Write a sequence for this structure.
């Protein structure tokens, strides 16, 4: 007979949905907060 | 362990008036626990103590000392945070106002106690051209000072 060892082992929603909503800092704004609509 | 140098970048000055000189930007940076002696890094710190950032970077990139690379890294980081975080429009418009080294938390090893030496590098950059060096006093300054000394003498110990 023959034996080989078998190949065993073959809350986040809001975090991930805000992870695609970085809206990273725009270089041309130069530090001014983007929140204001002015 | 005291960490004031970090806190020195959180000072919010009140907004200025139109008829008031523009307050130059002030940036404080440091690196802690560098595997180097404070005595050796004092030389590198002193070398760059009134230089522009570009001159300091040029000098450090061609120093053979170990602490040169570390100070160069600290200076580049300071330049980045100056332009980005502290509203300094020009990278070039900085100079090393302050550059010192302190001792860190040194370790003790058994050989025969020997000290594994650490240190901190502290820098402060200010926006603008480096201040011109103080000119060496002329003979006219010397003579003026001497004449003033002669003029300031009083009849001692009398009415």
């Amino acid at each position: 007979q023959t034996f080989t060892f078998p190949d065993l082992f073959p809350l986040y929603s809001m975090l991930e949905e805000e992870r695609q909503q970085r809206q990273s800092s725009d270089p041309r704004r130069g530090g001014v907060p983007s929140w204001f609509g002015l | 362990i005291s960490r004031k140098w970090e806190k020195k970048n959180k000072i919010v000055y009140p907004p200025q008036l139109p008829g008031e000189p523009r307050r130059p930007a002030e940036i404080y940076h440091c690196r802690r626990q560098i595997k180097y002696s404070k005595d050796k890094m004092w030389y590198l710190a002193k070398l760059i103590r009134g230089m522009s950032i570009d001159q300091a970077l040029a000098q450090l990139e061609f120093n053979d000392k170990k602490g040169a690379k570390i100070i160069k890294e600290v200076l580049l980081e300071a330049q980045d945070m100056a332009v980005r975080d502290h509203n300094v429009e020009f990278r070039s418009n900085l100079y090393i106002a302050e550059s010192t080294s302190g001792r860190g938390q040194c370790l003790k090893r058994i050989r025969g106690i020997m000290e594994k030496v650490y240190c901190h590098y502290f820098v402060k950059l200010v926006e603008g051209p480096p201040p011109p060096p103080e000119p060496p006093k002329t003979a006219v300054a010397h003579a003026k000072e001497y004449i003033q000394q002669l003029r300031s003498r009083t009849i001692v110990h009398t009415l």
About this structure: Chain A is about 20% helix and 0% strand. The first helix of chain A runs from residue 12 to 19. The two ends of chain A are 79 Å apart (CA to CA). Residues 1 and 7 of chain A are 19 Å apart (CA to CA).
